Design a protein around this nucleic acid. Sequence first.
RNA 1: ACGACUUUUUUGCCUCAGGGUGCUGUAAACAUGAAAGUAAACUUUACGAUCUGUUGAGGCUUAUCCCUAGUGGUAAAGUGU
RNA 2: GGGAUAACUGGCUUGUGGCUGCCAAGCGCUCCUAGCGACGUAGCUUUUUGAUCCUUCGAUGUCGGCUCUUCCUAUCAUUGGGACGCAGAAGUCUCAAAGUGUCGGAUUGUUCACCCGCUAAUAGGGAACGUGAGCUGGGUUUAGACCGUCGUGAGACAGGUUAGUUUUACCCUACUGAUGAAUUUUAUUAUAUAUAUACAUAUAGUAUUGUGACAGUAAUCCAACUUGGUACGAGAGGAUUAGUUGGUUCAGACAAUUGGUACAGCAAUUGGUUGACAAACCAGUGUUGCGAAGCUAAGUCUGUUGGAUAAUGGCUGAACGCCUCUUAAGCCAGAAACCAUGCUGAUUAAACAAUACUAUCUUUUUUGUUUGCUAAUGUAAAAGAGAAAUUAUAUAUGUACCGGUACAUA
Lengths: 62, 380, 132
Amino acid sequence: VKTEACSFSEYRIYPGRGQKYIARDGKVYFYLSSKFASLALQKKKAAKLRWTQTWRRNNKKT
Amino acid sequence: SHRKFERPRHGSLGFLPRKRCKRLRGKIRSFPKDDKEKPPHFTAFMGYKAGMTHIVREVDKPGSKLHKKEIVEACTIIECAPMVVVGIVGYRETPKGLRILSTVWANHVSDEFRRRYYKNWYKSEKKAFTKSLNVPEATKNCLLKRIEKYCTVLRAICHTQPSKTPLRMKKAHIMEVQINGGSMKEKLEFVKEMLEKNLPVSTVFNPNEMIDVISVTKGHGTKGVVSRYGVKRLPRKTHRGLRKVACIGAWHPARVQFQIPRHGQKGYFHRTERNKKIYRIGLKTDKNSASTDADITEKKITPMGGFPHYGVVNEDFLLLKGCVAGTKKRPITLRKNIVPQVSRDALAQVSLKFIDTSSKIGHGRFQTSEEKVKYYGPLK
Amino acid sequence: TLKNKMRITLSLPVGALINCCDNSGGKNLYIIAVQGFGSCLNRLPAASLGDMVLATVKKGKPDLRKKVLNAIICRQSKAWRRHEGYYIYFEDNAGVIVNPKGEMKGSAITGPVARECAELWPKLSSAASAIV
RNA sequence: ACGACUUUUUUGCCUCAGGGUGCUGUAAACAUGAAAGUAAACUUUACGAUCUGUUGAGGCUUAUCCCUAGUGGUAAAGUGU
RNA sequence: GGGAUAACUGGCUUGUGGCUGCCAAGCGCUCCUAGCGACGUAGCUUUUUGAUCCUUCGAUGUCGGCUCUUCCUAUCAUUGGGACGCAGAAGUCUCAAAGUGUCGGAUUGUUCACCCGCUAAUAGGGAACGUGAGCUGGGUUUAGACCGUCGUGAGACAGGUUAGUUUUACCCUACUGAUGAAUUUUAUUAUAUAUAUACAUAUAGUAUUGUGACAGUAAUCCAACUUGGUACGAGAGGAUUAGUUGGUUCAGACAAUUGGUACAGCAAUUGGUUGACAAACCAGUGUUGCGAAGCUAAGUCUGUUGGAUAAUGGCUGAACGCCUCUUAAGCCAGAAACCAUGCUGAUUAAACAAUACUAUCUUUUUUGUUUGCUAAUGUAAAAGAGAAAUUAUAUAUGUACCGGUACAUA
């Protein structure tokens, strides 16, 4: 079996779960959940929300 | 004069009056017809609704736009503790319908069955059943012989074991199951042989089978006409409200015609769903019941954190395609198809590819607790 | 040539205004009716990616104005369920004008184009810069 | 809606608690930490939005979530036949 | 004061309108009738308009829209057919058909109308001109106002235009849903081991399982492609039919997924307030962000096949030597129609069966039934209430041989 991987989160996506957003440029973004989708839509940078995995990677807290 | 434009009427006439069902348990209105040539066998089976999950399935179907790819489909889970058979019933045909000739019982019946023939089991002295149960085997044989000689349909009395479930109630569900098959003698033989033992789902169904599902719908109490029948709302300006029909009939004839919908009970209705394919028949003993050839991971059907309002499946279970009437914790009656099904669907072999066991409480990220612990690492 | 579209959620009811996104010289397209739409008591006609509309050009070159003209919808922002198991939506709604049997009027479709439309119109698929 | 229905009444059930599952988004607290600068000592002492560390933390999670022979509970005894 | 009398329905009639006939002079290349049909002539209908003034003036709320349901058929589409001036295709006329459907708009107060567009088709109607204690109030039909014409004037106008209160259900019924006792002038499809038995059976109480009379009833249409660039056709064009894959419209559910939703809950923060910090509170929900659970659609699943037929095509076959679908007797295939099947209800049958367990209880005999009570009587049918073959009807029944034959028998 395989899983896709999220864009905004670093989380693994089991099939039949999340949603897909295609930006005007032609970039596809897969978000695991609605909360991630809203957070992306409002244009927050993922590396600034402490709970999200991206901050953890950036802050040397792995 | 005629109405200015024409539409179908709101709501089917065919289920009126839309009153509450008599009973929580479903009822078979009619059984499949008795084709003589087939062996004796059960036609129905009782189960509890545990919840819904989604499944991933690979599609053979050619000439379809979808074709080769795997697709994601909703599916229902129905826990099925093995039924226990307790009685044999013989009916005979009369111009005034089926009349029961006699019933013959087993030599024991368990407490969970017994509780149903009382209202107040704790308060009672529990004196039901014991002296009839005693009477000697010649007597039973004499009645069986009478049944054997004259009866035209034989049905078996089966019951659920609710202690093998997580549900609150301990008064079992009793339900009759008609036997279709060979000679009256063979039919009788098969039920006698079965009698006091326990009957699991695998004896009644097969993989890839098409099944009929009978269940009582979700209750809502009394609901408004708009909700209950689908009527379009009136404009805002309206003086005495808007969420209600604007005419309930012409001047003549000078009565409210029944066909106009009015406010009232919605839900707790009896419903027969037809033609749902069974995707998988679980085995209680297996640790790998929810596993697949694609997945190869050890896991049970019960999703992460347990099914909402049903928790942990522990016996055998049916994974059924799509949806079926009624609530969580509800009994569901499975029935065989009235005519053997000859569709391109009914022949098909479902090699299911993945079964989700992630949470259904919030948006699940893992397939097991073991996965979750591994993902995060050390925590307080 | 096939027209077995498969159900994709309704969006774009009549009077919708979408981006034109081609080299015709139309800038926008106003959809006035959808082909093959039902007859029904008070439901607006409406479209989806696979549907053939009839539209007019409000802003654009003059000769494209006023004429009723056929178009095909290429992008939509109302979410739809692709059967593979996820919900798609595009950033903004868009279609392209066509000859009645679906031949594309210009030469290049500038946005990306859903595959669900691409499979349904070969002559349109060609001139799409990417298929998604 | 009220009735009614569905239940249970000590291998139960209610009750908290622990665990599970999520949801939120990193508590208070302390640092001779960082921080735009600032001011005042004969390098040290003041103020300081904010930030970092201890901190995927803290809080909440059945009232109509899940599990637990874990805790403590479990009255009235009426009335009709 | 008036239904002695108008403006509104209904009623009679049906001139008027609408719809259908019959004739056959012609039209239809030739050709009365494929399609037509003048000159004429007979009806029907009450969706029109009249004529009328029977009913209502101690008030039947006066147009239209919205919504909603049912009925009709004089059929528009869909189904099945027949005819053709029918090669295919397109189509016209026509018969069974009312099962199922019959749309988005622009403009108008509009019925009406006209476009534009979709369409499978955008059929025609009824129900107090269906629908005001359902709404709406744009129009018409109060008081104010304007302009014209008309009037010396007050003022007039089937001329235009503008501002102009829409009341009451808690009654009875109805209908939709919710409970619910009572039910002997009453029932009854058996009981009993090739024989019995209504002149008999049936207490009651809970409860479970069913029975299922009877009542209700639901699925619908399209596209695309294969059949086939074939049949057919001079070429151009160009199928029915199956079949395969999809969708529409409706119905019935459902919430895994997605979306919607917030006085579960966390977080953020403006203004004030508790000396500060912390904790908070308050701004009728302070305002935001996320937001479980539950509902929910714009999201997901699911929506049979026999019987008997109509129209019609046939078959055997006389009447009438022949012929003849029967316009006789006998038959057959055949439709979205009909009835089942299926599905819903079944205190719609004051319906009913089986089973589990239970409350002095049962039998015979005797005498009686001439504080509200504490012994107690009713008959729609007693006077010998007598009678189980079974099948025809222009023949039956036994019996014997093997429905035929023979012989008896009513």
